[PDB]
Amino acid sequence: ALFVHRDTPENNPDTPFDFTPENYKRIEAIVKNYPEGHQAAAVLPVLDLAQRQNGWLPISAMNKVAEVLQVPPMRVYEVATFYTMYNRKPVGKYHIQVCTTTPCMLRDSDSILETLQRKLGIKVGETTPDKLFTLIEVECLGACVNAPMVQINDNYYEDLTPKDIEEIIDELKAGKVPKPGPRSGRFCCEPAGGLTSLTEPPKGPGFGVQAG
């Protein structure tokens, strides 16, 4: 959105941030995930871990990650500004996302977006005053088949309708985080109208095995 930082009292280099002891063990594991040199490869996972330990990325975190990696902070800034999953402004306990590309706009995802706006009393990219919900319209998410979908903190709620997102919000507004997946008779990418690709069992080891 902005792609520039101005020192707010909240977001400033003296804003308090540090990793818990377990987070440091996760960091050294992550750095063992990449060679002895070229340890800057851990910028993305370590920065997601920072986003995960505090919910978002203050500049203090974006500098402490450079300190932890011994990398210049500008590279961490470049990374965080490039990738969209890194929240540089604070967001809510539940970060709502809605796909609006053609495979899900062509199934009227905007109906879900309307019924999701009126339920929260917000515009698209706004937050709620209770700091419990935010909202954005985003691009594809890889479940285009179950087209009308949303995403609430690392899980998908798919092929849903206005009733089946009002239900979801009423559950999120009570401490009950509900079950993800298709909110219909389906549970996966299967065709709804009965099995069509396979109903027989799967064959066992050695089936069709080549001579060798």
Residue ranges at the known binding site for [2Fe-2S] cluster:
99, 104, 140, 144
Least separation in angstroms between residue 49's CB and other proteins is: 7
41 binds ligand FES (CB under 6 A): no
Please list, in sequence order, all residues whose beta carbon lies within 8 angstroms of the beta carbon of residue 142, skipping any fewer than 6 positions away.
Answer: none
Q: Write the binding mask 113 to 132 for other proteins: x where contact by CB under 8 A, - elsewhere.
A: --------------------
180 binds ligand FES (CB under 6 A): no
Position among 46, 59, 112, 149 found at the interface with ligand FES (CB under 6 A): 149
Long-range Cβ contact pairs of 188-192 (< 8 A, separation 24 or more): 189/143, 189/145, 189/146
Q: Pairing between strand 133-138 and 150-152?
A: unpaired
* Stretch of residues binding ligand FES (CB under 6 A), selected from 16-24, 25-33, 143-151, 174-182: 143-151
The token pair that represents 203 in the structure block? 């064959």
State which residue, 1 or 129, has the beta carbon closest to other proteins: 1
- Helices 73-82, 59-69: axis angle to 10 degrees equals 120
State which residue, 155 or 163, has the beta carbon closest to other proteins: 155
Q: Pairing between strand 94-99 and 133-138?
A: parallel
Query: How distant, in Å, are the alpha carbons of 38, 42, 50 from that of 32?
Result: 11, 9, 18
Q: How many CB atoms lie within 10 A of CB 47?
A: 22
Least separation in angstroms between residue 26's CB and other proteins is: 4
Least separation in angstroms between residue 99's CB and ligand FES is: 3
Least separation in angstroms between residue 30's CB and other proteins is: 7
Position among 17, 19, 30, 160 found at the interface with other proteins (CB under 8 A): 30
Residue 164 φ then ψ, to 5°: -85, 20
State which residue, 134 or 151, has the beta carbon closest to other proteins: 151
Three-state DSSP at 169 gives helix
55 touches 91 (CB < 8 A): yes
Least separation in angstroms between residue 209's CB and other proteins is: 6
State which residue, 18 or 121, has the beta carbon closest to other proteins: 18
144 binds ligand FES (CB under 6 A): yes
